[PDB]
Amino acid sequence: IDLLIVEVVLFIAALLFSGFFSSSEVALISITRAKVHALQSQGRKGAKALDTLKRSTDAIQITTLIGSTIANVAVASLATAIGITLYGNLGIAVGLVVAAVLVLVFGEIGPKMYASRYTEELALRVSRPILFFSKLLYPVLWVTDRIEQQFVTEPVVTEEEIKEWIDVGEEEGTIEEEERDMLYSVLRFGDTTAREVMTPRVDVVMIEDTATLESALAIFNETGFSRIPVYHERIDNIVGLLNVKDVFSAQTSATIRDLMYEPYFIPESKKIDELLKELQVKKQHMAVVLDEYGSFAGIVTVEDMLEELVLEHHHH
Amino acid sequence: DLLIVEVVLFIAALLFSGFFSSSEVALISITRAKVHALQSQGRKGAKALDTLKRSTDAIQITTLIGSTIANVAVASLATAIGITLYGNLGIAVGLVVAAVLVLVFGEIGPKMYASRYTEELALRVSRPILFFSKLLYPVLWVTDRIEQQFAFRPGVTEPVVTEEEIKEWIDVGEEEGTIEEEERDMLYSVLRFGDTTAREVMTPRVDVVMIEDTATLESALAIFNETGFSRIPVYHERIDNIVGLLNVKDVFSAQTSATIRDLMYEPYFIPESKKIDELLKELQVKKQHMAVVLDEYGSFAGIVTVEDMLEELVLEHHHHH
Ligand SMILES: CCCCCCCCCCCO[C@@H]1O[C@H](CO)[C@@H](O[C@H]2O[C@H](CO)[C@@H](O)[C@H](O)[C@H]2O)[C@H](O)[C@H]1O
Ligand SMILES: CCCCCCCCCCCO[C@@H]1O[C@H](CO)[C@@H](O[C@H]2O[C@H](CO)[C@@H](O)[C@H](O)[C@H]2O)[C@H](O)[C@H]1O
Ligand SMILES: CCCCCCCCCCCO[C@@H]1O[C@H](CO)[C@@H](O[C@H]2O[C@H](CO)[C@@H](O)[C@H](O)[C@H]2O)[C@H](O)[C@H]1O
Ligand SMILES: Nc1ncnc2c1ncn2[C@@H]1O[C@H](COP(=O)(O)OP(=O)(O)OP(=O)(O)O)[C@@H](O)[C@H]1O
Ligand SMILES: Nc1ncnc2c1ncn2[C@@H]1O[C@H](COP(=O)(O)OP(=O)(O)OP(=O)(O)O)[C@@H](O)[C@H]1O
Ligand SMILES: [Mg+2]
Ligand SMILES: [Mg+2]
Ligand SMILES: [Mg+2]
C-alpha cells in the first residue's frame, strides 16, 4: 500500500508521456516544410524550433519512438508490478491486460487521433519539448544516424488520400463522375499560368484598326471565330477586341474602332484560376496576354479555362 | 517453475512485436507499381497484398495493435520475471531491460530490416497481417465512424462518404500545407456546384426570347440585333413545343435561298432536376452552348447556357472551416 501509491502516479505520468510523444509525432511530421518556412518568416512562437526538427525528419521519428517506447514499457512494467502485489501471480496477466488496453487507447491511438484534428496548433506547441528530448537522445541519434553510412513517414492526410476519398464518392454516387474529374482538375489547376494555355500570336487571327467594317466579316465568317483582337499598325500593338455580334448589328457608318472595346491585358504569368473569375466578373470572354516587354503574345478565352477543369481524369 | 512460463512468453511476444513493426514498413514501403507487377506475375502472397494495400490505414492499426500488445507483454513479463528474482528491483530491471529489447528488436530493428527487404517480406507477411486485419474488423468499424479523427479511417467497412466527409478531409489538408489555401476554396466551390440543378440556374420560360420557325431571316436578324443574344430557341405553333435552336453566326452567313428550319439544329432537352455538373460536361462535349429545360410534362420551362452555369460555379462559391 505504501509503495503502491507511488507506483500509480508513475503509471499515469508515463501514460501521459507516451501520449505526448505519440501525439507530437503526428503533428510534427505533417506540416509541409513549405509551410514551416512560412510560419518561421512570420516569426510565430514555435516555428523556429519546428524548422530545426524538419532539418532532419529522422530526428522526429527516433525521439518520439524512444520517448514513447520507454514510456509504454514503463506503463506496463509497473501495471504488472502493481497487479501482482494486488493479485499475487494472477497480476502479471491482469496487470498486463489492463495495461495493453490503456497503452492502446491513451498512449497510441487516442493521442494520434486527437493530433490530427489540431495538427498546426499542436505542432507549434510540442516543438520546444520534442527538440529538447532529441538533444538528450543525441547519443542514440548519432548511433542510428551513423549507421546511415551502411545503407520517411507521410502526413495523416495526403493530397492522394483526399483524391481517393473522392473516387469513393464517384463509386458511391454521392459525387457525380463528372465532378470527380473537376475536383481532380482543381488540384492540378491553381499553379497553372495563362501562358501555358494561351493561343500563340502566330496562330491568332486579328485585324488592323484601319480595315473596313465589311471586311471584318470576311474574317469572322471565314475563320468562324466570334472575337478577334484588333491591332494598330503593329501586330505587337493590340488596341481592342472586336465582337462579331457588334458587326452584324452595326450601323451603316461605323468603323472598326467604333465597335471594338478595351481589352483586359494580362501577363504570361497570370494564374488561370483567378482569371476565370476576373472574366466572369467583367462579363467578358477574351483576355489579351503580353510578354515581359509589353508586346502581344496571345489571347485566352473562357472556353480555354473551361476545357482545363472539365478534362477527364484517370481512375485508380 | 512459473518463471519458465514467463521467459518463454517473453521471447514469443518479442517476435510478434518485431513481426508487426517490420510488416508495417514492408507493406507500406512497397510501391504501387511493384504490387501491380507481382500481381500480373502472380507470385505467392501478391493477390492478398494488392487487397491489403487498398486501405493503408488498416495496415497501421493492425500492426500497431499487434506490436503494441506484444510490446506490453514483453514488458509485463520482464517486470514480473525480474520481480520474481529481484523483488521490487525487478520492476526496474524489467522496465530497463524490456525498454531496450523492444526498441532494438521490436521497433528499430524490424523497421530497418524491412526497408532493405520490402519485396520479399511483404509477400510473406501479407497473408498473416491480412488475416489479423479481418479479425480487427470490429475495431475497423468503430474507427470508420469516428469522423472527428483522420489518423485511422480504413474505409473498408462501407462508410457513407458524402460531400460532408470530403470537406472534413480538405479542411485538414489546408491546415498542414498539403493543399494550398486558395485551391481549397475551389474544392468547396465545385463541391457545392454539383448540388445545383438546372432549374436553380436556368432562365424561366417567361424571360426567354424565341422565334417561330415560319418567320423569315429578315425577321430573325432583327431579333438578334434587338435582344443582343447570339442564340434563340424555336417552336412550332405552340410555346410549350421547342423544336430547335437558331444561331446568329449562321443566319448572318446564310445563303440567298435559306430558311430558319434548315438553319436550326436539334436541341438538347433536359429535365428541371438535371445536375449542371453533368450538363456542363455534356454541353462542353457536344460543342453546344445552350440546353433546353423541360418540366415533368415535357413542356418548355427554361434554358441553361454554359455561362449560366459558370456564374453559379464562380461568383457564388463556398468556403468554410
Ligand atoms: C499532456 C501530456 C503531458 C505529458 C508531459 C509533457 C512533458 C513536456 C516536457 C517539458 C520539456 O521542457 C523543455 O525544457 C527545455 C529546457 O529548459 C526548454 O528548452 C530550453 O533550452 C534552451 C537551452 O537548451 C534554453 O535556453 C531555453 O530556455 C529553452 O529553449 C523547453 O522550452 C521546454 O519545453
Ligand atoms: C538503445 C541503446 C542505443 C545506444 C545508446 C547510445 C550510445 C551512444 C554511443 C555513441 C556516442 O555518441 C556520440 O559519438 C560521437 C563520436 O564521434 C561524438 O561526436 C564526436 O564525433 C562527431 C563526428 O563523428 C563530431 O561531429 C563531434 O564534434 C564529436 O564530439 C558525440 O559527442 C557522442 O555523443
Ligand atoms: C479507439 C477504437 C476502439 C475500438 C473499439 C472496438 C469495439 C468492438 C465492439 C463493437 C463492434 O461493433 C459492431 O461490429 C459489427 C461488424 O462486425 C457492426 O456491423 C454489423 O452491424 C451493422 C448494423 O449495425 C450491419 O450493417 C453490419 O452488416 C454488421 O456487420 C455492428 O454494427 C457493430 O455494432
Ligand atoms: N481571334 C482568335 N484568333 C485565334 N484564336 C482564337 C480567337 N478567338 C478564339 N480563339 C481560340 O479558340 C479557342 C476557343 O475559344 P472560343 O470557343 O471562346 O471561340 P468562339 O467560338 O468565338 O466562342 P463563342 O462562340 O462562345 O463566342 C480559344 O482557345 C482561342 O485560342
Ligand atoms: N434567347 C435567350 N433568352 C433568354 N435568355 C437567354 C437567351 N440566350 C441566352 N440567355 C441567357 O443570357 C445569359 C448569358 O448566356 P450567353 O452568354 O450564352 O448568351 P450570349 O452572350 O448572347 O452568347 P455569347 O456570349 O457566346 O455570344 C444566360 O443567363 C442565358 O440564360
Ligand atoms: Mg466557342
Ligand atoms: Mg514491435
Ligand atoms: Mg455571353
Author numbering:
A (entry chain B): 4 to 154, 160 to 258, 263 to 328
B (entry chain A): 5 to 258, 263 to 329
Paper text:
CNNM/CorB proteins are a broadly conserved family of integral membrane proteins with close to 90,000 protein sequences known.
After extensive construct and detergent optimizations, we ultimately obtained diffracting crystals of MtCorBΔC with an internal loop deletion (MtCorBΔCΔloop) purified in UDM in complex with Mg2+-ATP. The final structure, consisting of chain A (residues 5–322) and chain B (residues 4–154 and 160–322), is refined to 3.25 Å with an R-free of 0.27. Although MtCorB is present as a dimer, it does not show C2 symmetry. Electrostatic surface potential analysis reveals a large, negatively charged cavity that has a maximum diameter of approximately 10 Å and is lined with conserved polar residues. A well-defined electron density is observed in the cavity, and the density was modeled as an Mg2+ ion based on the TpCorB structure.
